[PDB]
Design an enzyme around this catalytic site. Sequence first.
Site, short mmCIF file in Angstrom:
data_model
loop_
_atom_site.label_atom_id
_atom_site.label_comp_id
_atom_site.label_asym_id
_atom_site.label_seq_id
_atom_site.Cartn_x
_atom_site.Cartn_y
_atom_site.Cartn_z
N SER A 58 0.85 -1.20 0.00
CA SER A 58 0.00 0.00 0.00
C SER A 58 0.88 1.25 0.00
CB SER A 58 -1.06 -0.04 1.12
OG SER A 58 -2.10 0.90 0.87
N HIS A 97 -6.85 -5.82 -1.51
CA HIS A 97 -5.89 -4.79 -1.20
C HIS A 97 -4.79 -5.40 -0.36
CE1 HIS A 97 -4.31 -0.77 -0.88
NE2 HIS A 97 -4.40 -0.76 0.44
N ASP A 119 -7.90 -2.88 -7.28
CA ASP A 119 -7.46 -2.63 -5.89
C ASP A 119 -8.47 -1.77 -5.14
OD1 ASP A 119 -5.94 -0.63 -4.00
OD2 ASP A 119 -4.80 -2.46 -4.04
#
Length: 358
Positions: A147, A301, A255
């Site tokens: 991330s 994610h 995502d």
Amino acid sequence: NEDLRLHLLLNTSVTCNDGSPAGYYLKESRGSRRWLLFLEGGWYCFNRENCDSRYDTMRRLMSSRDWPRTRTGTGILSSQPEENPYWWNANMVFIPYCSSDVWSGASSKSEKNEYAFMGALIIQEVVRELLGRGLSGAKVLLLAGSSAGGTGVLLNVDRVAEQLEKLGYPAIQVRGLADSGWFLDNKQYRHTDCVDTITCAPTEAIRRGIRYWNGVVPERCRRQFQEGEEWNCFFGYKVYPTLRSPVFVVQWLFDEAQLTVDNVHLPVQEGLRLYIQNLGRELRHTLKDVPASFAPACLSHEIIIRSHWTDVQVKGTSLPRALHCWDRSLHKTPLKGCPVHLVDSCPWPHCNPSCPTG
Ligand SMILES: *[C@@H]1O[C@H](CO)[C@@H](O)[C@H](O)[C@H]1NC(C)=O
């Protein structure tokens, strides 16, 4: 076993947001010359009020005061071969994300500044400190991240490579692994003027953040976009071509963070269906010239420190296999039977039956 042990930085002037010392968790593996340095993610904050909110309810991402002395390595940070087919025997380092600056900051706490934004400095200090714990004799340093940490890899890998080279460690091969940090500054779906600036206006929130953090982006990219436009270098497809280090890009085609910033929530009518299909096509397009990548057609994610990271496959190839094949390719073309470029062709989330189940 809780194999990752906390070390607060010996230079206690390299700090988390609140001025507490930053640090890293280390599992030494003295029989291995491979090092994995993982950058944690978790969005960012871009002005005083926004960071004060984060300080109220995400304080572990802004302070080391309550960090545990140990952590359990999961996914690519697991030492169990069954959980981590890729690099289970490596030296592993988890670098907690406590700078709220997408690992870009170079600003100390002061009478002027309530918060320190030192992510770019934290990485370099961790690297220097690890030289005394075996890193000096390494063959490979894989800087990985999920991330905001994945974007952190893109923003920092070349500086780690340059610093090591300049310090006298030319035999350490520095590489990157960016998971869920490859975003598009695309047109949103039926945009509205919503008040969560970070998801409603990402490029504006990043521009503002960079000023607040005294944020630093890699030199070649910086020089292309010039003053005021450094936000561009936070977008993988823009920064990636400017990088010298090999970087493996892992990105779900759908995502969840990308969809959030795109105003998408999953009957879906024609406009949104076409939007989502085009999103996956655009992402696949941006990955076409990345040599080594893994991009399944899933709504999820992050992946690399999740325990079930071994499950997902693209055309019968898992991520740990892809990463292994990537290693072989760097002995930068794949070897027969050992693919490094794995991007799904199907057009809708979960058209791959091996997607994570949520
Ligand atoms: C420690 O870190 C601070 C803040 O980055 C830096 O200014 C200082 O020079 C460092 N001290 C040492 C001994 O590296």
